[PDB]
Amino acid sequence: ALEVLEGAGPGRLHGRLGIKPDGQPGYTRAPSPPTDLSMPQALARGGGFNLYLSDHLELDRTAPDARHASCRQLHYDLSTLPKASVIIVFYNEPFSTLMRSVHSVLNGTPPQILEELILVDDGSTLPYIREDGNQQLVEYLKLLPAKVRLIRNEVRKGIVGARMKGIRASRAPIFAILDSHIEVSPQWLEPLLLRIKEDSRRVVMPQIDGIDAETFKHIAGGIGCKLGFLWKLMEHSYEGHQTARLPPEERQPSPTDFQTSPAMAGGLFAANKAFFFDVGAYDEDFQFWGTENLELSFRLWQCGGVLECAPCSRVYHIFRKGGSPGDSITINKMRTMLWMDEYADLAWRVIGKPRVNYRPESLEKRREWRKRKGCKSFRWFMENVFPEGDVVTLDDVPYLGPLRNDKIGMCLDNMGWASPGHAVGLEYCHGGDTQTFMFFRKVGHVMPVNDDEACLQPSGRLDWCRGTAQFWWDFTSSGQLMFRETKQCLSAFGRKLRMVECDDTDPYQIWSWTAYNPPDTFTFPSVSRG
Amino acid sequence: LEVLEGAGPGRLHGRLGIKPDGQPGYTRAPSPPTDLSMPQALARGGGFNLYLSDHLELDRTAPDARHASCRQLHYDLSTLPKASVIIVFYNEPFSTLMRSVHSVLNGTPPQILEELILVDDGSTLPYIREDGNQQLVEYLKLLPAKVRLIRNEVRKGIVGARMKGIRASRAPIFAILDSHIEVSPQWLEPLLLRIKEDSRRVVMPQIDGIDAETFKHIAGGIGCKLGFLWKLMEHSYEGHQTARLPPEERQPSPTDFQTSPAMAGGLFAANKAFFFDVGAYDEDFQFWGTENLELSFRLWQCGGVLECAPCSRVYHIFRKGGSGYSSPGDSITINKMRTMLWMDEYADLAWRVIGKPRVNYRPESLEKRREWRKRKGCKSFRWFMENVFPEGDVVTLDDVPYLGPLRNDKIGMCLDNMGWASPGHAVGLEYCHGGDTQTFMFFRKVGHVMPVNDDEACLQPSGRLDWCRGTAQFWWDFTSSGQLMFRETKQCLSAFGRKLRMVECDDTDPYQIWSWTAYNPPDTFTFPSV
Ligand SMILES: O=c1ccn([C@@H]2O[C@H](COP(=O)(O)OP(=O)(O)O)[C@@H](O)[C@H]2O)c(=O)[nH]1
Ligand SMILES: O=c1ccn([C@@H]2O[C@H](COP(=O)(O)OP(=O)(O)O)[C@@H](O)[C@H]2O)c(=O)[nH]1
Ligand SMILES: [Mn+2]
Ligand SMILES: [Mn+2]
Ligand SMILES: [Mn+2]
Ligand SMILES: [Mn+2]
């Protein structure tokens, strides 16, 4: 309700925030948490973080500068940089974390480059937010710059629907999407604006540091810039063996270099608004949460965009511990498979061949849009954007199906635990997903189809896949599973899994494995009719 | 001996249990003694009259409990998939077990019966033991080769016993039956046809009765749809719950397959592959109890459908005044805790109803089960209540607005179930102490006032608990002034004179003002520590 900045200075570029006319803070900080606080409870009561502590900490909390020293040697001309609209969507975000995020942005963003701060209430039900509530939020916003504007979805629409509401309400040539439980490092916005100014086709995302949900300590982010994806359709940081496949000039980049990434971690990024809509914005038939980051990543790269990571733009993020819709996660994965072309056959089988209502009629309009825009193929994506992946073409998956030993008339069985850490069994073949395995030849990995993170080991037991010799298997021309490092072979003798000297005359070590020969085109599965 | 001599209607597998010399392989007992004390014989027979069971024939003819229209259906046994029938037993007497086997063989066409797997779950009876008198093994030699016996060296329980049989089955479909049953004609054909069309269906026959005392065949009086109680036990749809169904489903034809939120016991058929893909059983369940609800919840949430076939009927001996075996006391509680994993926030209500137990529910294994639920992409329990069981009295926890003491401030006392909590006894007024005996809950959808430990017991204006019914005889309103008003008579409950009597409603009389703690459970149920 007031656009003035009284008290502006370093660490508080928008002036003293949230001060009442009488010079008192517009909210009552909480006392120190009780000494007998039961943490697993508070987390379950606080929606994934310790709210007793969050309420006690100041909204103007000072954070360590997580940037590399060389990031501070950079110069920005705030007069020539374009303005940006910061968007924070939230559903029932507690007052302390939400307002600390707002305070962090205003305190650490020069007013010259910040057009506005848009808060999107995605149908919250907490009394402190509701239109028919106690009005705490609305009352407190009057104590912040007029830049801050609140808009609401009368019904919770989800991440996509909520972000679209905010993006549409923005003015700046650039918008920046942030979480509702964050704290920024210094000069977080300047690098993003300069990068997008030079080329509006770039979608740039800050690097994400951590705030401990239990202690709220500031933690350095350990994630590199480059993110791949798993065939379960979730982003996955480049592993050691994947980083080694990069061009030698990109394996150890400077801490100030902007680095491309095939995929986006979450939803913290900046983009030119015009280009964002021309490249398809979001798929608004996505439901609530899940996979929209990968769908955007695939579409962006294929349809003329660039996804980059800015190590000099850092934002802290509270990762939940204590925790806190129907069919939404599976639907979003099916819709994302549109952009995977023939590779969708592999992803479809990995997530269990679901038969859901993915809104086919709407997905077909999205297919028409993809055609008109002239987007490139997923094969192009794998070969040019993510060529470091273990599966660049489907020929990299030569086998997919049961691993059957004819001698004992049984098949390998993950025993209902596709998670790493458990023993693999021998059971009578029934053709279900629990008994199908696939082979990634680039790494010699034997994995259950429902989890490309679990790998068979000579111990006869599953463990987390690593691109090393500890998980490298060869499937001989005679049907043997040979562990390359020890040059031994896996046997089913006595309905037990043991490693034995290789000998193709021993029928107990001869396995059959269905060849994987998927079609040139993935035909989506038919859909049927509170 | 896969040959069958004497095959005809009533004995589709031939004359069973005939010795080489043409005599039956077992001697029927004489008529029960005339001076038989029935309450004793039931206790000494494991829940049924064994004197009579031993006297009855193994080929006992049963009445056709099917609706007349069920016989007008035709099945093509050549196009139906085969099934493996599994019967697990722990110390089941010879007469009831073999009558079950005879009933299945006599009444199942050999073209659709792959095999009959008998699972000895560590029985100790001499007639079963490997080191016993060999009665069972010797008598099995007089039955078709389809019938094969397998054993658990140590008693594993219902889940462990069934999984052994399921894993050992060969047919694409398995059907589990109890060891004390008799089937109606064409019991298996409807299940095979239904699962053939859609392998995601788990179909269960309707269960008729065999009187434990007289062995009379009795028509089951329970409809097809089964809900559940917050004590975590299946419960047949009630009258007022059926009325909430769509009008086209309140009285369906006797040939229609009907969905059911919950499974009665363990009598069902399923595609073996799909059964394993949907998590099979939770093999950390102990001994007896609740696996049917865990399977029911998991089945619906993870892409399955539970249906009941009224044209598929099986008689079942329900025990009376006795049990065929004992189990630890905490084993049932453990199974209930593990079932609460699939109930999400609703587990808070279930936890309180069964008395906030603190048991060793094997958390490390249950947390792996949680990861499986995430990878599989199973839907939430709220989805289940709103989509699978929307006819329940508690669809959201908002349907339970009050849970806690019912206290009258005037006399400084609370309602007290007086150590009963079972229906049929008077409710008392006692000094408040905060224990389970003094906490009550309110189901607003039917106006029920119940002790927290029994959602089947309802307060009545008589000052006494009785079996809950969805009628005006149990409807209470909790006014804005704190009154318990019986809607039918428009009177209010008073504590005047430390007695519970109905009086004219008047918010100025302090003897009729009650306080009732509001129920506001968390968004997430945190399991108790072990
Ligand atoms: O239905 C929803 C779910 C989430 N969000 C908001 O979207 C942002 C991203 O969600 P989340 O915080 O879960 O992301 P993550 O914690 O995985 O970084 C947060 O501000 C949420 O409050 C929302 O507006 N609607
Ligand atoms: O530890 C056990 C308990 C039960 N059962 C068998 O499992 C079936 C189901 O048990 P029961 O009939 O007692 O269940 P109820 O119908 O009484 O709920 C019966 O054939 C039991 O003999 C078993 O094999 N092991
Ligand atoms: Mn977040
Ligand atoms: Mn990895
Ligand atoms: Mn039984
Ligand atoms: Mn009832």
Author numbering:
A (entry chain B): 98 to 421, 426 to 630, 635
B (entry chain A): 99 to 628
What did the original publication write about this model?
O-glycosylation of the protein CST1 by the mucin-type O-glycosyltransferase T. gondii (Txg) GalNAc-T3 influences cyst wall rigidity and stability. The strict glycopeptide-preferring enzyme TxgGalNAc-T3 then adds GalNAc to acceptor Thr one position N-terminal to existing Thr-O-GalNAcs and is predicted to sequentially O-glycosylate Thr rich repeats within the mucin domain of CST1. The structures reveal a unique GalNAc binding pocket that dictates the substrate preference of TxgGalNAc-T3, which is coupled to a 2nd metal binding site that is strictly conserved among apicomplexan homologs.
